[PDB]
């Protein structure tokens, strides 16, 4: 995020880091319950990647984090790699998240919900702060 | 290019798809929602993460960080997967698994 700010630690408890098995962060995701994460289809997550829950500082060795294994990846079949449309994948965890103060679920909308133009929303992540 | 150790957040406005087409033209589909061009941007390593809006006192997943400016320009909107367009698929996937 460019021109954002540091979050309050643990205040976005659905935010996960998708890490390969060697430890590098390549994508975000959101817990929607103890067994499921929503992420982007283009991230190309595999069952060898790790869901890291409860993280604030990726340089800390002292946070209470959960390293969760992935049972199965469900990429939306309508995902189009030419147009980047329908960019969603569900990860089914083999090791359920233990919900806590710092680990918990985001709500999903109804298909009919209206999020009007001009509404102030929020995005979070560990993306670059400068290109 | 600077990669933060600590989780970042930014508040930013949603756009209409018609207004987003000023920036990205026919690339903007029904299953996308744009947000930003407001002095902040999603950037490389934010992909797959959330765009959340309050509904009824609770944070709701409206978008999934997807694509945009190759420079993370803060005067161009980011493009997010529109969760309302994809949530029937989410719920059927959970219910079948």
């Amino acid at each position: 995020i460019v021109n954002g700010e540091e979050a309050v630690p643990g205040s976005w408890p659905w935010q996960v880091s998708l890490q390969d098995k060697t430890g590098f962060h390549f994508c975000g995701g959101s817990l929607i319950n103890e067994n499921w994460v929503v992420t982007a289809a283009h991230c190309g997550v595999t069952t060898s990647d790790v869901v890291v829950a409860g993280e604030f500082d990726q340089g800390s060795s002292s946070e209470k984090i959960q390293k969760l294994k992935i049972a199965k990846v469900f990429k939306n079949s309508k995902y189009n790699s030419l147009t980047i449309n329908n960019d969603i994948t569900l990860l089914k965890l083999s090791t359920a998240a233990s919900f806590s103060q710092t680990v918990s679920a985001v709500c999903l909308p109804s298909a009919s919900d209206d999020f009007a133009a001009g509404t102030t929303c929020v995005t979070t992540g560990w993306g670059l702060t400068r290109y | 290019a600077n990669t933060p150790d600590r989780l970042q957040q930014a508040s930013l406005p949603l756009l209409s798809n018609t207004n987003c087409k000023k920036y990205w033209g026919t690339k903007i589909k029904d299953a996308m929602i744009c947000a930003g061009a407001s002095g902040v941007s999603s950037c490389m390593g934010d992909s797959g993460g959330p765009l959340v809006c309050k509904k009824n006192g609770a944070w709701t997943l409206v978008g999934i960080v997807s694509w945009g400016s190759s420079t993370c320009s803060t005067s161009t909107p980011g493009v997010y997967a529109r969760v309302t367009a994809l949530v029937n698929w989410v719920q059927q996937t959970l219910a079948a698994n």
Binding site: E5, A7, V8, P9, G10, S11, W12, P13, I32, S100, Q101, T102, S104, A105, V106, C107, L108, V122 | Q9, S11, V52, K55, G57, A58, W59, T60
Partner: peptide, 13 residues
Amino acid sequence: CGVPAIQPVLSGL
């Protein structure tokens, strides 16, 4: 869902 035990604080509210 969607109510963090640690409430987020955003500049400008």
